[PDB]
Amino acid sequence: IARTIVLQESIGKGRFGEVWRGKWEVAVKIFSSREERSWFREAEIYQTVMLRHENILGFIAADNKDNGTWTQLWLVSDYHEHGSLFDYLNRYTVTVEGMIKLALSTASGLAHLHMEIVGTQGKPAIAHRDLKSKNILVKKNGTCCIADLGLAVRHDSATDTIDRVGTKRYMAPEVLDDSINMKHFESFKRADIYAMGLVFWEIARRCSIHEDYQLPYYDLVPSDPSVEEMRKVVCEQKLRPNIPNRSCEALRVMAKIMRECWYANGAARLTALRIKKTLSQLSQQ
Ligand SMILES: Cc1cccc(-c2nc(Nc3ccc4[nH]ncc4c3)c3ccccc3n2)n1
Numbered sequence: 001i002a003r004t005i006v007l008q009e010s011i012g013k014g015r016f017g018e019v020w021r022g023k024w025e026v027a028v029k030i031f032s033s034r035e036e037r038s039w040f041r042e043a044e045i046y047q048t049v050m051l052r053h054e055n056i057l058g059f060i061a062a063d064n065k066d067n068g069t070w071t072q073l074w075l076v077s078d079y080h081e082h083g084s085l086f087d088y089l090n091r092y093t094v095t096v097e098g099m100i101k102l103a104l105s106t107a108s109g110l111a112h113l114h115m116e117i118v119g120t121q122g123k124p125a126i127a128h129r130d131l132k133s134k135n136i137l138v139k140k141n142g143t144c145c146i147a148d149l150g151l152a153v154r155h156d157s158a159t160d161t162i163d164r165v166g167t168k169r170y171m172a173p174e175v176l177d178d179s180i181n182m183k184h185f186e187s188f189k190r191a192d193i194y195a196m197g198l199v200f201w202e203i204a205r206r207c208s209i210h211e212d213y214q215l216p217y218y219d220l221v222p223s224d225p226s227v228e229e230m231r232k233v234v235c236e237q238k239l240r241p242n243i244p245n246r247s248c249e250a251l252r253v254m255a256k257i258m259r260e261c262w263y264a265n266g267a268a269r270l271t272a273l274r275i276k277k278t279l280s281q282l283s284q285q
Helices: 035-048 085-091 096-114 183-203 228-235 248-258 272-283
Strands: 006-013 018-022 025-032 057-066 070-075 137-139 145-147 153-156
Touching: 006 272, 018 153, 025 035, 035 057, 035 070, 057 145, 085 137, 096 183, 096 248, 145 183, 153 183, 183 248, 183 272
Parallel strands: none
Antiparallel strands: 006 018, 018 025, 025 070, 057 070, 137 145
């Protein structure tokens, strides 16, 4: 695997690890030996039984590569020329149909992650914990696939047990004020929903008349905001990304979804499955 891959271009970096475009085209994330725990954990999540799905980054393999001086810890995946949704939305505007495709595919991927699949070759429910436009990738066919599962948590339904991290800007209210129950898997699922809502906001702005690209809370917090800065806005002032006045039926549906993803109480939010259904219906209309 790694033995026969030739790196060609530096294309980014994760929380840990540098991302490269290589030829085996494939994407490669390289970690140093001191980052073994992060490398292993993400490898572990990607190797979960029945995890593969069209809206989840396609994992190829985890490997080691000794260059003669030091050993590199590798994770290899499919390569998508468009890269992140973040980059995609900055570079282009989208049609109503394109917006629906991006939102539906993301929701379909999160629903798959959240969904426990019962059976001999079953899949446990999984919560992402760091969903953002920067780790969702856009495929050539206009659909998304979710990446970086290194902070994910897996649920054992038989015992309701699992096996402050994350991107500040996208942290759920309960995470920002630390009221979230770290022992309650469902709470992590709900927190993902809040984040996906913000992502939907980023996409809707680009649906073209249209708004320029912006990260959520762009006009309320500084870049690389701290937990406190976020908490004051989201928890104390209780603000959420602004919903433009103009409206289209599709955009109206999106906005409603957003609002229902932004409740301070996770238990009040919509589920990924419900969002997928609603988006599916809209796509048909
Ligand atoms: C498990 C794994 C293997 C390889 C790369 C990543 C990865 N990639 C990111 N970015 C990225 C950028 C452009 C791309 N084109 N085709 C694929 C692709 C991937 C990440 C960005 C943020 C956090 C983690 C990432 N992990 N994860």
